[PDB]
Amino acid sequence: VKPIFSRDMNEAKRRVRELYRAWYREVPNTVHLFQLDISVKQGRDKVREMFKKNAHITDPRVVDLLVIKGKMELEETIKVWKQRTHVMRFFHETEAPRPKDFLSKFYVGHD
Amino acid sequence: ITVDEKLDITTITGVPEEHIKTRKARIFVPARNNMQSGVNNTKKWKMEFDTRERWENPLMGWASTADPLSNLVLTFSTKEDAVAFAEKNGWSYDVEERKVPKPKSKSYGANFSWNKRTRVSTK
Amino acid sequence: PTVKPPTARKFIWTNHKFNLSGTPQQYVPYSTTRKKIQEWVP
Amino acid sequence: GVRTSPTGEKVTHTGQVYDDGDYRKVRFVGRQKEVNENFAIDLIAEQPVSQVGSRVISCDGGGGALGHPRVYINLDKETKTGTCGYCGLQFRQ
Amino acid sequence: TVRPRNDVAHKQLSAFGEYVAEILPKYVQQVQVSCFNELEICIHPDGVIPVLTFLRDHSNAQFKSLADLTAVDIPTRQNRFEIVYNLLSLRFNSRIRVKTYTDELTPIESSVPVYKAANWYEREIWDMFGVFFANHPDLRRILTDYGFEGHPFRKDFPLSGYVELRYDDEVKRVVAEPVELAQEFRKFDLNSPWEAFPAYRQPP
Amino acid sequence: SNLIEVFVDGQSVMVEPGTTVLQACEKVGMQIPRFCYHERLSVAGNCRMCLVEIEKAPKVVAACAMPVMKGWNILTNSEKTKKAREGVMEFLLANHPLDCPICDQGGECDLQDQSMMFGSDRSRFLEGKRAVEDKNIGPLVKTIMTRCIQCTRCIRFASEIAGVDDLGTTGRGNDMQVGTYIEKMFMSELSGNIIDICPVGALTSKPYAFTARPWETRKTESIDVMDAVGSNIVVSTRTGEVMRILPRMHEDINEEWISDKTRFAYDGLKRQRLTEPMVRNEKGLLTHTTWEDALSRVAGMLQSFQGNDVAAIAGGLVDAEALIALKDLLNRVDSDTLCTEEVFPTAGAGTDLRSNYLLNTTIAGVEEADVVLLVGTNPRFEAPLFNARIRKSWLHNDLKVALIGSPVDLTYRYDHLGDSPKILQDIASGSHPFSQVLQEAKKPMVILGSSALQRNDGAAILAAVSNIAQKIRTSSGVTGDWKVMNILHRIASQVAALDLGYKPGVEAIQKNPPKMLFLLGADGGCITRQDLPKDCFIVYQGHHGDVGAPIADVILPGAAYTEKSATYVNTEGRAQQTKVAVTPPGLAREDWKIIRALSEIAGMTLPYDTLDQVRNRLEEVSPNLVRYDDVEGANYFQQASELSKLVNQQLLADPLVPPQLTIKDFYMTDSISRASQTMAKCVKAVTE
Ligand code: SF4
Ligand code: SF4
Ligand code: FES
Ligand SMILES: [Zn+2]
């Protein structure tokens, strides 16, 4: 009667576990074959900070859509497409951000 | 076959960077202009976001802005639909009630009054 | 200059300038902003 | 036409002298500032006021060739000559 | 009279407004619209494959060709996306529109087994709008960047984007991305007062 | 029960008897093109554009004139109705100059929008075009009468609502000039609304003149400050600059008009304003400094001093977010002694109970009144929107208005009951010219002005209003839900400060002198070098600093009403939320952010992170200022009258005269409009 995308409630979490298992084994492939850039340890920390943002699990449809999206943005580097270090760099390194404070943001210029 | 119906609040999956939580939406119906006496811009809901910092550019003379989400006007048919869309996006909304024009009995016979002081002087 | 001459306007320059390049007397931008004035005096 | 600033850079059509404390003056160091020799303000007064016999006259540049919408100007006022919204041309009587 | 266009084949084409409607499913038909010798049918999302197998190799209606697979994004409705399958008959010389409706995040039955051209347009909708399609082989990003966030068309986000400015800065090879400053777009508030058209205004 | 069923294009609609054809068409959604008719103004059939053909009739009738009777099929899209609209449009534009490029009105023009949609594509016209000599009406309104379509709408505006009587038709046929014959300099209240009344580019704003076209400027809704009524006006911004301020239609805020002193004074915020934080140097003069350094010099004194020796004097252009933050910075860090700039009585439960602090009767509730017994105040000078509402209540319905306390020029009648405080005391008892009319009334209302309240006889005028109102309403006057006493505050912040919990008047600062005073937006003459008998250390925080700014040690720049996005309280008792239209110039910051950063620099830090956090804390202190655009009436008026009557005070000998009792007096006032290129030019020509 209703669409379910891929999985219903519980199995969607196991798909994230399947996605984390595959993407954890692909970080040595994005250093040796691709480019060294930063580090193997920091590359695995780059995974953890991405999934910590998605702490709001409430629907099976929202989780599964993020899995399908995850099976393209992280599948891009498995079957290597044109990125050449300029693309596929998720972590911001060029720009320095201002900390969230009432005394720091007001001194610099915000809102 | 296989429905798996789940009732929960809407969440943003295809969302940009940290700017949604800070910016506040103002879903309010646009007021009629002072000079233009026509009602066509009204009777349709508009979700316009609050304007951020704007400064004159050192390059030339134009006023360039750093804020990306600013120059967009959305259309809505119902007030309930506009409020549901704002919750679906993630941004906090401050809805304003539609100011309907009050029906005033403006009759031509009142201009030529005898007892009343509503008599029009010099046409 | 033989059959049909351009009409005089007394506004157009008599001597034509060369191409604007990396050499001096080149193009530069400016703004007409009068700016919002600030008042502070002892 | 326009009066030269004590700083150095020439004033444009409007009074636009750059401030002494302002950093936006490096642009005109080395390369010259493009300022027009013919100023439009002085050219309005330079053109003579034409005389009209009738009450109302219509202003035109030169028909359909020179760009001007046909505007009729009332000439009832004796003091201050009547001028159209487009040209700086003035009319009397 | 000179200046307007004349219509005569409207009544001949209106017969399909009865013909496809006389098949009569609540699974398919719903609402039928016909104007200026063109047909618009809006169909429930659950059935798309069984709808497009019909009008294909059928003796009365032989279309066989899919030219456009456009999608309409509209925030007014609860069902946000109105995907339009535009079909063209080469045997009968007529055009039909197979409209659908999908909300924020629900899969529709994709027409990969029906049409072999659909898959390229199906990837385009998933890029621009974010509408996922079930039973689709290899769903990839074509128009977007290989590290692009959000969906490029959606009326939720601005015209200028978010990762628009790209520098060749202090790092030798890496091109910068996350800077969001740009020159301001002059959004002109142009919308004429007074309704110009009768037979369009609805009572509240 | 008084309803008529009629047909618009064959569709059923129910209407009240007496309503016009155009009023019936508005119900279904139709809008007939018009030029004379207005929602607030009277009815005249001048232009004859709103022609609509009803079947079984030889002649086409106007939508203005005809009242709807039983059984009419109004055809809007018939063969004759289209030909009628196309015909008259050609007549309207036959004698109208080609001025659209030089016209101040662009896309907003009524002739442009209607001629494109309803009028013909081409004109038959060959020869003609009349030319009209322009008359200089005023320095505030530019007048080019060549473009005027002789519609007669401004003439009705000046006569019926403004009540000035200067404009009039002179001549016949083509040679008809709209305007004053005697070449009189027309300057009055509500004169900045006649530019919006005129549908064409005949009347336009002279201070605005030429800056942007209607389509180019992005519109933003905001509540106008520096006015008692608090009118709603959509402020237009053309790339980070406030170009024009135009009023929007609203039921509560008088009508669809803004004040003349509020609308024309747009340039005042842009001419002179504090950009950088200025601290007093060792030499003497104030010098520009860094934001971190200027805050550290202010926090060094603020954290050091503790007790009753620290008091803030704020009033004028102050916000509700500024009020909630300054109270949290003073009462928590030290002893609370915060004072308001505007003088208001607090002897007999003044600050306590909402019924005594603000006006009990609604701003729209002035229309449903039997007799208005106004105190010694000038409605023409203070709040022009409220004076228009009182005039509209006098014009539409028969209601005798009485104003006792120094005679002044007014749009209404007269009926003044002397000029004495003793006459007000006699009015409380069995008076001869008054009291008898107050006893026999449906719903009487007494409006007490803040102009007389801010004097020596503060409690004496308050007890006369409470004693007079208590003896009238409770005895026989009021029959259910009706207000007796009303108080209209002159200052914009005065209504907001009393509701929050600020001590009214400068008496709190005069009794005990503070060591360091952080005066947030000081405009009124309350704090001075002679007033404070110690080391100054005065902190000035507010936009546009001309008065009060030289007598300060550490001045911090703030945002104006167009800059800061915060709530504002109305005279009736309504919280209207203002939105940010333009970014603050220079290094200036918001009012809510300025106090939170001062607490962060010091030891004691206030619980505030964002604008939502400041709104939540303001909701806890007062629930009335939490809900936007929703006003609720205060209960228990008899309990407040009994507490106020306990105090004994002698009445003053001097008559209750307003400080602003002139037409030129309401041009340069409250310091915010004093530093303006438009206001100073208007005030100089008002006398000359
Ligand atoms: S009033 Fe309207 S039609 Fe007339 S010149 Fe001005 S913009 Fe043009
Ligand atoms: S000036 Fe404007 S409002 Fe007055 S009569 Fe002329 S067109 Fe009408
Ligand atoms: S608008 Fe009705 S006659 Fe002019
Ligand atoms: Zn001309």
| 3-state SS record for F239-295 | CCCEEEEEECCCCCCCCCCCCHHHHCCCCHHHHCCCCCCEEECCCCCEEECCHHHHH
* Closest of F89, F95, F143 to residue F120, by C-alpha: F89
Q: Residue F61 phi/psi, 5° resolution?
A: -95, 150
Cross-chain residue pair D34–C32, CB shorter than 8 Å:
no
Question: d(Cα F624, Cα F308) in Å, to the nearest integer?
Answer: 29
The torsion region of residue D58 among left (phi > 0), alpha (psi -120 to 50) and beta comes to: beta
CB-defined site of ligand 2, < 6 Å: F 148-154, 178, 197-198, 200, 202-203
Query: From the candidates D14, D17, D34, which should be mutated to test the interface with C, based on the most C CB atoms within 10 A?
Result: D34
Chains E and A touch (3+ CB pairs under 8 A): yes
Cross-chain residue pair C24–D14, CB shorter than 8 Å:
no
Which residues, 6+ apart, have CB-to-CB distance to F273 below 8 Å?
A: C36, C38, C39, F543, F544, F545, F557, F560, F585, F586, F588
* A26 CA: distance to closest CA in chain F (Å): 41
CB-defined site of ligand 3, < 6 Å: F 34-37, 45-50, 62-64
Cross-chain residue pair C26–D33, CB shorter than 8 Å:
no
Pocket probe for ligand 2: among F111, F203, F204, the residue whose CB has the most ligand atoms within 8 Å is: F203
**In this structure, what is the dihedral angle of CA atoms F193, F196, F197, F203, given to the nearest 10 degrees?**
90
Chains E and D touch (3+ CB pairs under 8 A): no
> In angstroms, what is the resolution?
4.1
Give, for F604, the enclosing helix (H) or strand (E): none
Q: Which residue of C has its CA nearest to F585?
A: C36
Give, for E132, the enclosing helix (H) or strand (E): none
Question: d(Cα F506, Cα F341) in Å, to the nearest integer?
Answer: 6
CB F259 within 8 A of CB F385: yes
Pocket probe for ligand 1: among F108, F111, F129, F197, the residue whose CB has the most ligand atoms within 8 Å is: F111
Tokens of F288: 């520009």
Q: What angle do CA A38, A42, A48 make, to 5 degrees?
A: 140
User: Which residues on neighbouring strands pair with residue E68, listed in sequence order?
Assistant: E86
Q: What angle do CA D7, D9, D12 make, to 5 degrees?
A: 130
Residues in chain B: 123
Q: How far apart are the first and last CA of chain B?
A: 77
Can you list the alpha helix ranges (DSSP code H) found in F310-440? 320-330, 354-357, 384-395, 421-428, 436-439
The rounded Å distance from CA D71 to ligand 4 centre is 7
SS3 B25: strand
Which residues, 6+ apart, have CB-to-CB distance to F577 below 8 Å?
A: B94, F223, F565, F566, F567, F568, F628, F629
Tokens of E115: 């049409």
* A35 CA: distance to closest CA in chain F (Å): 42
> DSSP assignment, residue D28?
G
Inter-helix orientation angle F611-621/F591-601, to 10°: 90
User: By the CB < 8 Å criterion, does A91 face chain E?
Assistant: no
Tokens of D63: 């028909």
Question: d(Cα B70, Cα A72) in Å, to the nearest integer?
Answer: 30
Strands F242-247 and F232-237, sheet pairing = antiparallel
Strands F51-54 and F73-75, sheet pairing = antiparallel
Which residues, 6+ apart, have CB-to-CB distance to F170 below 8 Å?
A: F176, F177, F179, F181
CB F42 within 8 A of CB F36: no
Q: Whose CA is nearest to atom 3 of ligand 2?
A: F198
User: By the CB < 8 Å criterion, does C34 face chain F?
Assistant: no
Question: Residues 67..106 of B with a Cβ closer than 8 Å to E: which?
Answer: 68-78, 81, 84-85, 88-89
Tokens of E99: 């409209």
Question: d(Cα F110, Cα F105) in Å, to the nearest integer?
Answer: 9
Question: d(Cα D55, Cα D73) in Å, to the nearest integer?
Answer: 9
What percentage of chain D's residues is helix, strand, coil (to nearest 5)? Answer: 10, 20, 70
* F102 CA: distance to closest CA in chain D (Å): 6
Task: Give the amino acid at A9.
Answer: M
Give, for F4, the enclosing helix (H) or strand (E): strand F4-8
Tokens of B122: 């010099």
Q: How many domains does chain A have?
A: 1
Can you list the alpha helix ranges (DSSP code H) found in D1-93? 40-46
User: Which residues on neighbouring strands pair with residue F172, listed in sequence order?
Assistant: F175
Which residues, 6+ apart, have CB-to-CB distance to F312 below 8 Å?
A: F326, F330, F338, F339, F517, F518, F519, F520
- Please state, as a whole number, how many other Cβ atoms lie within 10 Å of the Cβ of residue C37: 11
Distances (CA, A) of E167 to E171, E177, F48: 10, 7, 63
CB F593 within 8 A of CB A106: yes
Could you say which of F98, F132, F133 has the minimum Cβ distance to residue D71?
Answer: F98
Partner chains of D (3+ C-beta pairs under 8 Å):
C, F
Its domain, for residue A102, covers 1-111
Question: d(Cα F322, Cα F315) in Å, to the nearest integer?
Answer: 11
Question: d(Cα F620, Cα F626) in Å, to the nearest integer?
Answer: 9
> DSSP assignment, residue F394?
H
Q: Residue D62 phi/psi, 5° resolution?
A: -175, 50
* Closest of D62, D48, D9, D60 to residue D32, by C-alpha: D9
Cross-chain residue pair A3–E106, CB shorter than 8 Å:
yes
Task: Give the amino acid at F656.
Answer: L
What percentage of chain C's residues is helix, strand, coil (to nearest 5)? Answer: 0, 0, 100
The rounded Å distance from CA F259 to ligand 4 centre is 37
User: By the CB < 8 Å criterion, does E146 face chain B?
Assistant: no
Tokens of F235: 């402020």
Q: How far apart are the first and last CA of chain A?
A: 47
